Amino acid sequence: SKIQIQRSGHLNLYLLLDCSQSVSENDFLIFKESASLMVDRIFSFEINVSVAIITFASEPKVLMSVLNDNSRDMTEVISSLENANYKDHENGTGTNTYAALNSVYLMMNNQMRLLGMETMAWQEIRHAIILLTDGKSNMGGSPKTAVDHIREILNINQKRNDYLDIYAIGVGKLDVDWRELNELGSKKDGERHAFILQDTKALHQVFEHMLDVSKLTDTICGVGNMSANASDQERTPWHVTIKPKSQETCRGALISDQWVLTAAHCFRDGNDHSLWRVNVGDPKSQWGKEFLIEKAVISPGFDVFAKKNQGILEFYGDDIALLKLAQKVKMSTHARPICLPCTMEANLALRRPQGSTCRDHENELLNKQSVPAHFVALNGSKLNINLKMGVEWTSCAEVVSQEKTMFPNLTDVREVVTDQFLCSGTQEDESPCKGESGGAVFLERRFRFFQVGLVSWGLYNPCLRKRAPRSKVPPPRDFHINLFRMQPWLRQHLGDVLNFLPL
Numbered sequence: 001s002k003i004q005i006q007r008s009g010h011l012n013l014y015l016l017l018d019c020s021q022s023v024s025e026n027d028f029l030i031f032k033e034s035a036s037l038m039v040d041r042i043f044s045f046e047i048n049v050s051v052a053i054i055t056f057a058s059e060p061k062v063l064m065s066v067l068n069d070n071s072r073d074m075t076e077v078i079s080s081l082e083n084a085n086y087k088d089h090e091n092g093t094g095t096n097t098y099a100a101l102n103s104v105y106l107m108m109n110n111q112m113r114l115l116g117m118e119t120m121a122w123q124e125i126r127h128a129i130i131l132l133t134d135g136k137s138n139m140g141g142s143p144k145t146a147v148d149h150i151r152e153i154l155n156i157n158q159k160r161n162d163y164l165d166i167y168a169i170g171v172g173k174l175d176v177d178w179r180e181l182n183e184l185g186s187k188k189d190g191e192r193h194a195f196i197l198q199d200t201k202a203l204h205q206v207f208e209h210m211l212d213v214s215k216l217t218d219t220i221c222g223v224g225n226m227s228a229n230a231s232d233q234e235r236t237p238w239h240v241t242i243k244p245k246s247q248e249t250c251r252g253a254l255i256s257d258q259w260v261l262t263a264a265h266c267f268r269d270g271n272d273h274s275l276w277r278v279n280v281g282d283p284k285s286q287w288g289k290e291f292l293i294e295k296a297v298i299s300p301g302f303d304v305f306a307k308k309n310q311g312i313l314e315f316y317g318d319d320i321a322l323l324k325l326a327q328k329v330k331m332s333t334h335a336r337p338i339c340l341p342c343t344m345e346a347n348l349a350l351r352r353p354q355g356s357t358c359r360d361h362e363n364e365l366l367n368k369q370s371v372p373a374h375f376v377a378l379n380g381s382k383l384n385i386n387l388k389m390g391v392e393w394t395s396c397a398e399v400v401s402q403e404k405t406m407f408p409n410l411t412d413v414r415e416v417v418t419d420q421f422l423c424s425g426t427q428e429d430e431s432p433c434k435g436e437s438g439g440a441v442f443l444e445r446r447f448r449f450f451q452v453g454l455v456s457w458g459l460y461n462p463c464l465r466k467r468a469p470r471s472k473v474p475p476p477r478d479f480h481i482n483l484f485r486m487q488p489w490l491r492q493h494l495g496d497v498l499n500f501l502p503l
């Protein structure tokens, strides 16, 4: 009933953009913006996908054909779309949707001819057509007739139901013809295939629900669900709960199908890992699934009382741990590894050049003096922070000299906050609670998720679903272990787990 995101076979996606005079010039820019979002998203899954781009009024115009190998190149698809001009159809501003759909038919006929009707290269292709239109066809005859023709060539019935989806979406400040939208994108079973949406934000939500990713079960990193209607676990599937002996909880992140990344300070009782449990996401229950631990590696530099002779009562240098789960996790919508920077996995996720390095990844991901990021709350919800970098890191970390509990003897901030920590908590940031520690601090780029740090400590615990700030000294401020500073140790233990880039 949905567009299938999977490794096997091939996806042909046809984007048909209504460029007729009932679509204003600005309405068309909204269409181009929606198309670009669907292209960027469909490519984020690293599946085999070709994209055709057609604009249409009285005549259709093919900017990209699936017969062009360039339609598998996200770069060339996006440029051909951005090259699309409203005035391209100035000589025929009517609305001939049939002609636009027939253009897709002729495309299919030609590729089937190319590859060969009887070949698997042709049989394996799934076809998804999305029309961005206000639905007001007024020439060429019935779009349904061209849809019948497409369904004929593709051999669609109940069995081969999954090889064609047609969607018709009106996005923007349009006068939409609803009846016509529904003729174009009729229902498959119960699944809606016609939508009227106010803007590209609504489209982005709706497109998430058009994509079936349940069959995507390999270890692809940093894939999430960005619908509000998805569960918390589906939105952050790397996210895990950690249960030490101490009965207190921590959070952590799946970084492969068997390894979890978390905070060292979570394990106060010591190093007896056989009493610890991890809850990873699971489709069958919101409780998740409990795993035991095969082995634990706590950073050898971690020791909360290391600086206690200097009157510093808690020191969180090297606050990091790796847990190997007793079994491999089964990858699913509720359980995926997050992307770790400085790996080939993360380099592909970012669509970067081959010979990138760790420095490159740091530079791309932590690209500003204030970098918007997230951590996941106790209730599973996604919370917002701004990582303070370069010159702003110093003034961010400065307020720890006002801490009254942890450090009664502190003549030097850089004895407690070293270069090992990212910093947030200023302005209107959320601050992690103690139970949220160990959890990923992560960014989103190109629709993929990247762990740049982990929750370690802060000056103010809001949980001391329910949360509270205040307005007195010292101010909230939070310090996260920076994964870019932990590379040597991570490589020592994950070198045969992930493929690390040159430094």
Ligand SMILES: *[C@@H]1O[C@H](CO)[C@@H](O[C@@H]2O[C@H](CO)[C@@H](O[C@@H]3O[C@H](CO)[C@@H](O)[C@H](O)[C@@H]3O)[C@H](O)[C@H]2NC(C)=O)[C@H](O)[C@H]1NC(C)=O
Pocket: 002, 207, 208, 209, 210, 211, 212, 213, 214, 224, 225, 226, 227, 229, 230, 231, 234
């Ligand atoms: C983002 O998350 C949403 C919410 O889970 C995903 O939509 C869901 O997609 C699944 C997979 O096909 C649908 O499963 C079907 O459920 C119906 C019951 O209503 C059942 O009859 C079928 O047997 C099948 O199991 C599910 O309906 C659907 N849920 C909603 C609210 O639409 C979406 O696919 C996810 N997208 C991405 C990009 O990860």
Ligand SMILES: *[C@@H]1O[C@H](CO[C@@H]2O[C@@H](C)[C@@H](O)[C@@H](O)[C@@H]2O)[C@@H](O[C@@H]2O[C@H](CO)[C@@H](O)[C@H](O)[C@H]2NC(C)=O)[C@H](O)[C@H]1NC(C)=O
Pocket: 087, 088, 089, 090, 091
């Ligand atoms: C819009 O049409 C004009 C005019 O084209 C002429 O009249 C049309 C109705 C049609 O019958 C054409 O065959 C005629 O040529 C186009 O302007 C022409 O562009 C061509 C090729 O680019 C060029 O050789 C001429 O200078 C132009 N002809 C005249 C007489 O103006 C214009 O390109 C069309 N707009 C499009 C399709 O973007």
Ligand SMILES: *[C@@H]1O[C@H](CO)[C@@H](O)[C@H](O)[C@H]1NC(C)=O
Pocket: 377, 379, 380, 381, 465, 466, 467
């Ligand atoms: C989860 O906690 C956040 C953090 O304050 C809160 O905003 C959100 O409403 C909570 N979700 C609920 C109430 O289930």
Ligand SMILES: [Mn+2]
Pocket: 020, 021, 022, 023, 094, 095, 136, 137
């Ligand atoms: Mn029109």
